[PDB]
Point group: C2
Chain length 82, copies 2
């Protein structure tokens, strides 16, 4: 359970408070704090962008196993027929 989405939501909320506060809160610490949270979210985002690339691969691997199973089933059925 990654907290990345919550850290980005939190940094987004602070950013909204600064924008609605006419740039107040743009302190070096607060900007660095928001920055660090943005970095956590980005790193998790890139890991997820790589992960979802594997879903199409897993789906084809499943179709391969289904065809391999299907060929075994037909051979088993024919042998059981005679």
């Amino acid at each position: 359970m990654s907290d990345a989405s919550d850290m980005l939501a939190a940094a987004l909320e602070q950013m909204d408070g600064i924008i609605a506060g006419s740039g107040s809160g743009s302190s070096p610490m607060h900007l660095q704090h928001i920055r660090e949270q943005m970095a956590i979210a980005l790193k998790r985002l890139k890991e997820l962008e790589e992960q979802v690339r594997t879903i199409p691969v897993l789906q084809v691997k499943i179709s391969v196993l289904q065809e391999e199973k299907r060929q075994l089933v037909s051979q088993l059925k024919n042998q059981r027929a005679a």
Copy 2:
């Protein structure tokens, strides 16, 4: 979609403001950073939901592999009876 690029861009502008390398820190610039962060968050949540399917697909792979091993053993048993 391109949200990871938008967040990287917002990170670069934020670092340009923090380091003082001429990147603009007006409310407009902060507004632009905000909007990029918002798109990235929406994409991030969508991806957190998507990757949950990977354990499900992997179980489907393990189930099919087990079914194959069991079909092989029945096929060997049945190829023997066909000689009777």
